[PDB]
Amino acid sequence: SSLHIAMFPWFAMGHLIPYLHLSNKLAKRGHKISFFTPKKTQTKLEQFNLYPNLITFYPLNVPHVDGLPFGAETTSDVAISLGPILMTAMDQTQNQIELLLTQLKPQIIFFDFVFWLPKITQRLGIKSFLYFIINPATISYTTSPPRMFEAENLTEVDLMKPPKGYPTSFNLQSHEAKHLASTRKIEFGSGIPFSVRSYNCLSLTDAIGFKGCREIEGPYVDYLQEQFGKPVLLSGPVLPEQSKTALDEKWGSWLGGFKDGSLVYCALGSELKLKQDQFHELLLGLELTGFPFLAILKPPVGFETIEDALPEGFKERVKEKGIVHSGWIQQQLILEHPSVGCFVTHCGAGSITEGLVNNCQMVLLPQLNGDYIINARIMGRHLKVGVEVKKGEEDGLFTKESVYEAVKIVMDDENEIGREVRSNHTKVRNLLLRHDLESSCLDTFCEKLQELVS
Ligand SMILES: O=c1ccn([C@@H]2O[C@H](COP(=O)(O)OP(=O)(O)O)[C@@H](O)[C@H]2O)c(=O)[nH]1
């Protein structure tokens, strides 16, 4: 029998998009989806709804919080330092969420962050499902019980090593462990420290799920199920679904002028702005390669346009071989274009999946966020499907020569590291795209969801 599932992701394109990809896969199996989205944002999500008779959007009015830019609904509308105020606003949707649950009566609700929800749902006889679209390796590293009983005695040297029990080994740099130790204590919505919020969610939910498959995420899902004593499910790798909107003819024509596999695509997601020094180093490093390139970047901190921030003489030298562009583009469609030979990525979980299912060589340029950092280590050191750009151990900055070197290595057909990461990427792509991999993951997923509502 088909399930009625409500979807309540965090107000960010990096959560909305994979929740919608998964919604389409569940609707294809006959399940009914009630998708809660900020009101104005719904118009940009319609293109991804492939089953309008089963997936219905329900708008949320994102309420005012002191400091929130007017009319802001998602992390694409606010600076990254304003995220905690946006999460206060999400907390404040509780009244209209409770209204929607009592009228719609879903059997399950998938959610992020809102640890007050499981109390509402169990009063209504609804199962709460904490569904992560980031890597369970990240949650396993930062928010497993061993980390949380240390409370404020958790130091940067503590975060250099993995918690007790952790299933794999990798190294963080000093500045990364320092970032994890500080941001963990920062208030993220309604005065709750970030790690306390997420540990409340893990503790109070009925079940937990992650994007991923047994072959890659399995060891971390096992570790978390042992730690938290409740079901920890895998949805499958959430392979991107096809949009109802074809590739913008302006990008299609320009990309089509380049030799197959010759172009470097660089994008750092939907939220962040580089400091001007690192913006310059990145662009000068791409220029050094002599390859054509498309860099999708916001203007650096303190600047409002790309043109004002470009290194001197840059546009004149680069001419028609390279473009630096600030707007939202159809990244998934660009990564499938045959001209793209290299993807320089901030290692967001969605961008990683999009890169892995395509042919591009991966250059890892993780920005300062726990999931990006841990994704980069797993891709660089465990799966060995990409080359990571060297950063300063203490300052977290890169040089233009390190960007240049990483791209050169993966683009050079005779470079044995480049050939090795290409071969490993092919192995991972062949796994993710195996004819029965996603379908058997979703088979198990749906059986376990049925168990949950039984
Ligand atoms: O101009 C852009 C920027 C981003 N994306 C998409 O936005 C998502 C970003 O998710 P990810 O987990 O990579 O990173 P985040 O935005 O959370 O840092 C991915 O699906 C990208 O394909 C896009 O389509 N166009």
- Over the chain, what HEC string results? CCCEEEEECCCCHHHHHHHHHHHHHHHHCCCEEEEEEECCCHHHHHHHCCCCCCEEEEEECCCCCCCCCCCCCCHHHCCHHHHHHHHHHHHCCHHHHHHHHHHHCCCEEEECCCCCHHHHHHHHCCEEEEEECCCHHHHHHHCCHHHHCCHHHCCCCHHHCCCCCCCCCCCCCHHHHHHHHHHCCCECCCCCEHHHHHHHHHHHCCEEEECECHHHHHHHHHHHHHHHCCCEEECECCCCCCCCCCCCHHHHHHHHCCCCCCEEEEECCCCCCCCHHHHHHHHHHHHHHCCCEEEECCCCCCCCCHHHHCCCCHHHHHCCCEEEECCCCCHHHHHCCCCEEEEEECCCHHHHHHHHCCCCEEEECCCCCHHHHHHHHHHHHHCCCEEECCCCCCCCCCCHHHHHHHHHHHHCCCCHHHHHHHHHHHHHHHHHCCCCHHHHHHHHHHHHHHHHCC
**Rounded Cα gap, residues 36 and 52, in angstroms:** 14
**How far apart are the C-alpha atoms of 17 and 353, rounded to whole Å?**
12
Count of other CB atoms within 10 angstroms of residue 44:
14
Q: What whole-number distance in Å separates Cα of residue 333 and Cα of residue 92?
A: 36
Q: What number does the ligand 1 atom closest to the CA of 352 have?
A: 13
* Tokens of residue 265, six digits: 């695509």
Distance CA 105, CA 250 (A): 45
- How many domains does the chain fold into? 2
Residues 346 and 206 placed together within one structural domain of the fold: no
| Structural domain containing residue 253 | 249-432
Nearest CA to ligand 1 atom 14: 348
CA of 452 from ligand 1 middle (Å) equals 31
Residue 92 and residue 68 in one domain: yes
Indicate whether 68 belongs to any domain: yes
Long-range CB contacts for residues 388-395, cutoff 8 Å, separation at least 24: 388/363, 388/364, 389/363, 389/364, 389/365, 391/173, 391/175, 392/175, 393/173, 393/174, 393/175, 394/174, 394/175, 395/175
Q: Are 243 and 333 in contact (CB under 8 A)?
A: yes
Top mutation candidate among 274, 296, 329, 331 for ligand 1, by most atoms within 8 Å of CB? 331
Solved with: X-ray
CA nearest 228: which of 167, 164, 145?
145
- If asked whether residues 100 and 131 sit together in one domain, one would say yes
Same domain? For 258 and 381 the reply is yes
Which residues pair with residue 38 across a beta bridge? 60
Can 112 be counted among the known catalytic residues?
yes
Residues at the binding site for UMP are 328-329, 331, 346, 350-351, 354
- Do residues 322 and 211 both lie within one domain? no
150 with 70, same domain?
yes
311 and 333 assigned to the same domain: yes
Residue 214 Cα, ligand 1 centroid: separation in angstroms?
24
Provide the terminal-to-terminal Cα distance of the chain, rounded to the nearest Å: 12
Resolution for the entry shown, Å: 1.7
Residues 227, 214 within the same domain: yes
User: Is there a contact between 334 and 294 (Cβ–Cβ < 8 Å)?
Assistant: yes
Structure tokens at 194: 């970030």
Q: Look at residues 362, 247, 272 and name the one whose alpha carbon lies nearest to residue 76.
A: 272
Ligand 1 lined by 329 (C-beta under 6 Å): yes
**Is 244 domain-assigned?**
no
Residue 144 lies in a domain: yes
Q: How far is the CA of 249 from the centre of ligand 1 (A)?
A: 20
- With a CB cutoff of 8 Å and minimum separation 6, the contacts of 424 are 383, 384, 385
Distance CA(381)–CA(17), nearest Å, equals: 27
Catalytic residue among 77, 91, 112, 371: 112
| Residue 373 and residue 346 in contact, taking contact as beta carbons nearer than 8 Å | no
CB burial string 164-191: b at 16+ within 10 A, e below: eebeeebebbbbbbbbbbebbeeebbbe
Q: Is 332 in the pocket of ligand 1 (CB under 6 A)?
A: yes
Rounded distance between C-alpha atoms, residue 332 and residue 345, angstroms? 13
Q: How many angstroms separate the CA atoms of 369 and 346, rounded?
A: 10
Contact present, 133 and 15 (Cβ < 8 Å): yes
Cross-strand bridge partners of residue 295: 266, 324
The distance from CA 371 to its chain's CA centroid, rounded to whole angstroms, is 8
The minimum-distance atom of ligand 1 relative to the CA of 347 is: 13
Atom of ligand 1 nearest to the CA of 351: 13
206 lines ligand 1 (CB under 6 A): no
Give the CATH number of the domain where residue 319 resides: 3.40.50.2000
Structure tokens at 83: 């995220």
Burial of residue 14, with CB atoms counted within 10 A of its CB: 0-12 exposed, 13-18 middle, 19 or more buried: buried
Separation of alpha carbons 243 and 48, rounded Å = 5
Is 342 part of any domain? Answer: yes
Active site residue 412: no
Sequence-separated (6 or more) residues with CB below 8 Å from residue 435: none
φ and ψ of 234, to 5 deg: -120, 130
Asked if residue 269 and residue 160 are part of one domain, the reply reads: no
Residues 88, 199 within the same domain? yes
Does residue 86 sit in the same domain as residue 182?
A: yes
* Ligand 1 centroid, distance to 433 Cα (angstroms): 21
Cα 346 to middle of ligand 1, angstroms: 10
| The CA-based dihedral angle spanning residues 155, 379, 203, 148, taken in that order and rounded to the nearest 10 degrees | -10
Q: Which residues are annotated as a binding site for UDP?
A: 270, 328-329, 331, 346, 350-351, 354, 372
CA–CA separation, 446 vs 454, rounded Å? 12
Query: Are 218 and 111 contained in the same domain?
Result: yes
